[PDB]
Each structure stands twice: as structure tokens, then as C-alpha cells.
Design a protein around this ligand. Structure first.
Ligand SMILES: *[C@@H]1O[C@H](CO)[C@@H](O[C@@H]2O[C@H](CO)[C@@H](O)[C@H](O)[C@H]2NC(C)=O)[C@H](O)[C@H]1NC(C)=O
Ligand SMILES: *[C@@H]1O[C@H](CO)[C@@H](O[C@@H]2O[C@H](CO)[C@@H](O)[C@H](O)[C@H]2NC(C)=O)[C@H](O)[C@H]1NC(C)=O
Ligand SMILES: *[C@@H]1O[C@H](CO)[C@@H](O)[C@H](O)[C@H]1NC(C)=O
Length: 621
């Protein structure tokens, strides 16, 4: 049925901490993993800053504002936390205009001690850490210079004087662009692309007539203006610029743009905006070389170059993505693919639901999910779809049933098999979070009035129980939990006011007495992913192979632990003509998978899809 006597267990595991300060903004950062360190930066308007630190996963805080000498901190930059468990933090201060250069506070003890240094310049962007080493930092000044440091901020040196974009690469390699005359705004389309693998000792130009560049996966993209027109194309290199090749994508005008929806180690999603202010574009998918692209989804919804898109990578299950499209009648609709872009289809309606006013036929409708685009329209959608790699097949999102995204108050839906089937979880907008690799899910109401109740479920979203965690209702502001969905601590943030006495508060609840017992070998059951028809001999193998998981049973209340790794067992299907895509100068006509040439590189005509692992069968080569 359900667990009982939970109120007593949770009574002793609730801790309240009240922050005494002026209520301005709040910025929360996690330092490292498994350390439990958190930093809170309160900024307000002269201006003042307060800095708080914890070592207890947010249960207790201490005021370390005296370590930064009570200096004001630019919140626009925020905090520059180092990679991995480096325990490095950098804060940029505000200094008088007459000063020659800026000023930073830098630590390497997980914020236990800070050291003050004066830079010889005025930073224009945020410091960037090298992925390979955390002692390397670069930044651009206000005069468009490029300064690098090999000492973690101790000493800086200038390596170029007219840069306008720089980013790190693998093996401490720096790519940047420089403008010869004027400014990168005025000199756009005539830039250069340089590289230096020695941190400023030698340079090698790897591009001319550049318009922009970007890094994704193991590819390097650069947009180059045409010789005699404003149209620009794309070039891709896998050698860090030693050799280039031209991608097989249509050119764009001056008002259009490109966009890397998602890049992988063996694949990239690309968006190409159609001419005019139509508001939609197209999605292309590449091969493992990043050269040949095939049309994937038409009328993809993309607001503008700095706009919003609903594209989402469902990380719970393999090769599943969700996005929004614009229908012929100008109604926003949602699509889902399970083949990694091979095909797209509408979401399946919940088994027991009724279509809303949007639907024309009450016996025919589908689910539609609110996302970042709906948030951009000032609607009652507090969050976006949520999924974790270590929680298998669990997806939570706000949605409404109908023939298009409705403009009424949404509900919350959950899918326990990657997105094949959905069911209604809760009524009305909520804030949700996954704890302990799917062992517990918590929900908080999203209302305009004070709330003093939290709901949790151990059946993986089937039955819920309420717990009253405070006597004085607060105005909820947001939840906080350690990244990775592997902890059992949840922090609730909010403020309570009576008469000008608003004051931040937070509550931290520990579920260690609910999941008392450790999961055994008898609490896990075998599960087959991507299953559609059990009778079929080859059922459930997507992209050439199938996998079986061991998932915790919904009727077991146990703790997975922080050292949980998902069990798995791939099995390989056979190869068919559906596992290959046409290559270069070929196309695939309608109602057949054959590749026929259009009525120096040369191939047979077929190219295996990136990620396929099929063996034997039919090899059209
Ligand atoms: C979508 O998310 C999934 C899950 O995080 C990504 O799969 C991982 O990809 C990394 C490399 O980026 C691999 O090292 C991991 O082994 C993958 N994890 C798995 C399969 O559980 C996937 O790459 C993402 N897709 C895109 C296009 O970025
Ligand atoms: C939830 O927070 C508590 C805060 O006490 C964590 O307990 C600490 O965990 C760290 C892990 O590095 C241990 O070194 C400490 O000794 C623990 N403190 C105490 C007082 O026991 C706890 O680990 C967190 N829970 C989860 C699941 O991560
Ligand atoms: C803090 O700043 C003041 C500014 O007057 C300065 O005199 C003082 O030396 C600083 N303290 C430390 C420990 O650097």
C-alpha cells in the first residue's frame, strides 16, 4: 500500500536557516562533487554583496563576506567554478574608474581562503578554464586584447591585440578571430581565424573571409562569405583546422542563420532558417564525417537567432528527442523521434483522458508539451521537460491534451518507458525533482499564494503523500539539489513577509529514514527497451542492437546509494536496407530505400548510419 509513520521520520530531518540581509538577487553554485559545498551570492543596490558558504549540503551556512574584504562583486559574470573536483573559484570585483586594471579574488581550497590580485587590464568577459588543466585561464579585455595565464591568475600576458572571439579546445588549443580594420561589427565577413597550441608562442592562420566559428563534438564549424555575393556557406574540419571540407547544406542569405541544435561524437543536428521572417526552419542530420546532411524535420519552430526552441534530448533513453513544429494552420504541435532523427510522430494520447476544446474529434487527439517557447510567452509553465541518465525511462513535463498546445492551465504528465506512453501525474502546474536515481520524486505546488506542503512518491509517480514542513507559509522561489540526481537532500527556497520584513529562508529535508534498507539483488527486474510488439522475432532493437536493463521494482522501497551503476546487456540485430543512408551524390526516391544517383570523393552509394552496430544480413556495397 503505502509507507506509514513518515511524518515522525521526516520531523527530525528538517533544518531551517534564515538569512538576514537585504533581499536583492540570489546566485547559487555547487563546488565539486560529493563535497557538499555551496556558495550563495546576494547582490543589491551604491551596491553591496553578501557571500555565504556551506559544507553540509545546504543545511548550515556561514557568512564569509569578510574574506572578500566587503567588496562589491559583479554579478553579471557570476562565479567561475573550475572543472571536475578542482575546487577553484574566481570572483570579479568592481573598482573605481581611475584604476588602471580590474581586481579578482581567487581560491583553490573549495572557498576556504581567497587571495586578492590586480589585473593589468579591464576584463570584458568571464574567465574560461581549460578542460585539460584548471591552471590555465584566458579573457578578453575592453580594448579587444587576448590575455592568457598559466598560473591561475597570478600573472597575465597579452598574446594578441585585436581579437573579438576566443574559445579553448582540446589539448590547450586556442581558436580566435581577429579583425584587420574597424571593428568586428563593421568588419564582419572579412575576419580571420587563427590557432595557437603553444599558448601564445606560435600562430597559424586557418581561415580567411570568416563570418563566425563554433565548436561541437569533434567538429569545427566555420561560416565563410561567398566570393561575389553576401551568401555564406559552412565548412567543417576534424583536424582542428589543418584540412577543411565543404558541408552539403544549402547556402543562406544575410537575414538567415545556422544553429547547432546538438552535436555528438559521431553526429550533429543542424538548423537552417528559411528566408524571411517565417519563424520556422528545417533540421538536418549528418553522417559520422559531418559532410553529408539529410533533411530530417520540416517547419521546425525557432523564434530568432537569439530566440527560443523546444528541441530536447531525452537523456533517459537512447536516441529519443522531442521538439515542436508549426502546422499548416499556424498551430504549435509537438513531435517525438525514437530513431535519432529517422522518423517523427505525434505523442500518444494518455489512455484515460478527454480531448480539450482544441481537438475537433473527441475520439482523436494527442498530448502536447509546453517547453521553453511557452515560457517565453509568459504562460503558467514553471519548468521544462526533466530527465536524468541514471533514471531509466522517466520523463516529466507540463502538458495538455488536444490538437495544439492549449492556452489554459497545464497539468503534469509522466512516462516510465522513455516517451512511448504517458499518464497524468498531478493536477495544475508543479515544480518537480528526481532524487536518488529515480528512487524518490518530489513535487511542489506553483501558486501565487504561500505554500507549506511538499509531495513525494516512491512508486515512481503512481501514489503521492503530503508532508507539512513548516508552520509559517512562505512564498516559494525555487528548489535546489546536487547535480546528478544521485543525492537524497532537497533544499526549498522562499521568503516570508509581514510588513516590509521580507527575509530569505530555506529548508533542507533528508530522506534517509524513508529509504532505510539498501537495495538487494531481489529488488531488480529485467526490462526490455524500445519494445513495440513482443511476438516479433526482432523486437526492441533500435540502430542495429537491443538492450535489456535491470530496473528497481515499483513495489520496493530501498536506497540505490551513491555508487549505483545501471546494469545492461546489449544484443545485436541483423543489418537491413533501413540501416543505410545515401552518400554524397545520391538521393532516395519515394516509397523505396534504394539510393540512385542524381539524374575528389567517390563511394559505392550507401553509408552506414552513425551509431549502427548491426552485423551480417544485407550489405548493399
Ligand atoms: C543525448 O543525451 C545522451 C545521454 O546523456 C547522450 O549520450 C551520451 O553521450 C556521451 C557523449 O556525448 C557518451 O559518452 C555517453 O556514453 C552517452 N550516454 C549514454 C548512451 O547513456 C547523447 O550523446 C546526447 N545526444 C546528443 C546528440 O548530444
Ligand atoms: C545529504 O546531506 C548529508 C549532510 O550531512 C550528507 O551526509 C554527509 O555525507 C558526506 C558525503 O561526503 C559524508 O562525508 C559526511 O560524513 C555526511 N555527514 C553526516 C553528518 O553524516 C549526505 O551524504 C547527503 N545524502 C546523500 C544521499 O548524498
Ligand atoms: C581591505 O581593504 C582595505 C581598504 O582600505 C585595505 O586597507 C586592507 O588592507 C584590506 N585588507 C586586506 C586583508 O587585504
Amino acid at each position: 500500500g503505502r509507507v506509514r509513520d513518515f511524518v515522525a521520520k521526516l520531523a527530525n530531518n528538517t533544518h531551517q536557516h534564515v538569512f538576514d540581509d537585504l533581499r536583492g538577487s540570489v546566485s547559487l553554485s555547487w563546488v565539486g562533487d560529493s563535497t557538499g559545498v555551496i556558495l550563495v551570492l546576494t547582490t543589491f543596490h551604491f551596491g553591496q554583496s553578501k557571500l555565504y558558504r556551506s559544507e553540509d549540503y545546504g543545511k548550515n551556512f556561514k557568512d564569509i563576506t569578510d574574506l572578500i574584504n566587503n567588496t562589491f562583486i559583479r554579478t553579471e559574470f557570476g562565479m567561475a567554478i573550475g572543472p571536475e573536483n578542482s575546487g577553484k573559484v574566481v570572483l570579479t570585483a568592481e573598482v573605481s574608474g581611475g584604476s588602471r586594471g580590474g581586481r579578482i579574488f581567487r581560491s583553490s581550497d573549495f572557498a576556504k581562503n581567497f587571495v586578492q590580485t590586480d589585473l593589468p587590464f579591464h576584463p570584458l568577459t568571464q574567465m574560461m578554464y581549460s578542460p585539460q588543466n584548471s591552471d590555465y585561464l584566458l579573457a578578453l579585455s575592453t580594448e579587444n586584447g587576448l590575455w592568457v595565464s598559466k598560473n591561475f591568475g597570478g600573472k597575465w600576458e597579452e598574446i594578441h591585440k585585436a581579437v573579438c572571439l576566443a574559445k579553448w579546445g582540446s589539448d590547450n588549443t586556442i581558436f580566435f578571430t581577429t579583425y584587420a580594420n574597424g571593428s568586428c561589427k563593421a568588419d564582419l565577413g572579412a575576419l580571420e581565424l587563427w590557432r595557437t597550441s603553444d599558448l601564445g608562442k606560435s600562430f597559424k592562420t586557418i581561415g580567411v573571409k570568416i563570418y563566425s566559428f563554433g565548436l561541437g563534438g569533434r567538429f569545427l564549424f566555420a561560416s565563410v562569405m561567398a566570393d561575389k555575393d553576401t551568401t555564406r556557406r559552412i565548412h567543417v574540419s576534424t583536424d582542428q583546422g589543418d584540412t577543411w571540407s565543404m558541408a552539403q547544406l544549402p547556402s543562406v542569405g544575410q537575414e538567415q542563420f545556422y544553429s547547432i541544435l546538438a552535436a555528438n561524437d559521431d553526429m550533429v543536428f543542424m538548423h537552417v532558417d528559411e528566408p524571411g521572417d517565417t519563424g520556422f526552419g528545417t533540421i538536418f542530420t549528418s553522417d559520422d564525417r559531418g559532410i553529408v546532411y539529410s533533411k530530417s524535420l520540416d517547419r521546425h519552430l525557432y523564434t530568432t537567432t537569439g530566440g527560443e526552441t523546444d528541441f530536447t534530448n531525452v537523456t533517459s533513453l537512447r536516441g529519443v528527442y522531442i521538439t515542436s513544429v508549426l502546422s499548416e494552420d499556424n498551430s504549435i504541435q509537438t513531435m517525438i523521434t525514437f530513431d535519432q532523427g529517422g522518423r517523427w510522430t505525434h505523442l500518444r494520447k494518455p489512455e484515460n483522458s478527454e480531448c480539450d476544446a482544441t481537438a475537433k474529434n473527441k475520439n482523436e487527439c494527442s498530448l502536447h508539451i509546453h517547453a521553453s517557447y511557452s515560457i517565453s510567452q509568459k504562460l503558467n509553465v514553471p519548468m521544462a521537460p526533466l530527465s536524468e541518465p541514471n533514471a531509466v525511462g522517466i520523463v516529466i513535463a507540463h502538458g495538455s491534451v488536444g490538437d495544439a498546445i492549449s492556452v489554459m492551465v497545464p497539468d503534469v504528465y509522466i512516462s516510465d518507458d522513455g516517451g512511448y506512453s504517458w499518464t497524468k501525474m498531478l493536477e495544475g502546474p508543479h515544480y518537480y525533482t528526481i532524487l536518488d536515481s529515480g528512487g524518490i520524486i518530489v513535487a511542489i505546488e506553483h501558486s501565487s499564494r504561500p505554500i507549506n506542503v511538499i509531495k513525494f512518491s516512491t512508486d515512481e509517480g503512481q501514489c503521492w503523500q503530503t508532508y507539512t514542513f513548516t508552520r509559517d507559509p512562505i512564498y516559494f522561489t525555487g528548489l535546489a539539489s546536487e547535480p546528478g540526481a544521485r543525492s537524497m537532500n532537497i533544499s526549498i527556497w522562499g521568503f516570508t513577509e509581514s510588513f516590509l520584513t521580507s527575509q530569505w529562508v530555506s529548508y533542507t529535508i533528508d530522506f534517509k529514514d524513508i529509504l532505510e534498507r539498501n537495495c538487494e539483488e531481489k529488488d531488480y527486474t529485467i526490462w526490455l527497451a524500445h519494445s513495440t510488439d513482443p511476438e516479433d522475432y526482432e523486437d526492441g532493437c533500435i540502430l542495429g542492437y537491443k538492450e535489456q536493463f535491470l530496473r528497481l521494482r515499483k513495489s520496493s522501497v530501498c536506497q540505490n546509494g551513491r555508487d549505483y551503476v545501471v546494469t545492461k546487456q546489449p544484443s545485436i540485430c541483423l543489418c537491413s536496407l533501413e540501416d543505410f543512408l545515401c552518400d554524397f551524390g545520391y538521393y532516395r526516391p519515394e516509397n523505396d530505400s534504394k539510393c540512385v544517383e542524381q539524374p575528389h570523393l567517390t563511394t559505392n552509394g550507401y553509408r552506414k548510419i552513425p551509431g549502427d552496430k548491426c552485423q551480417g544480413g544485407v550489405n548493399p556495397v
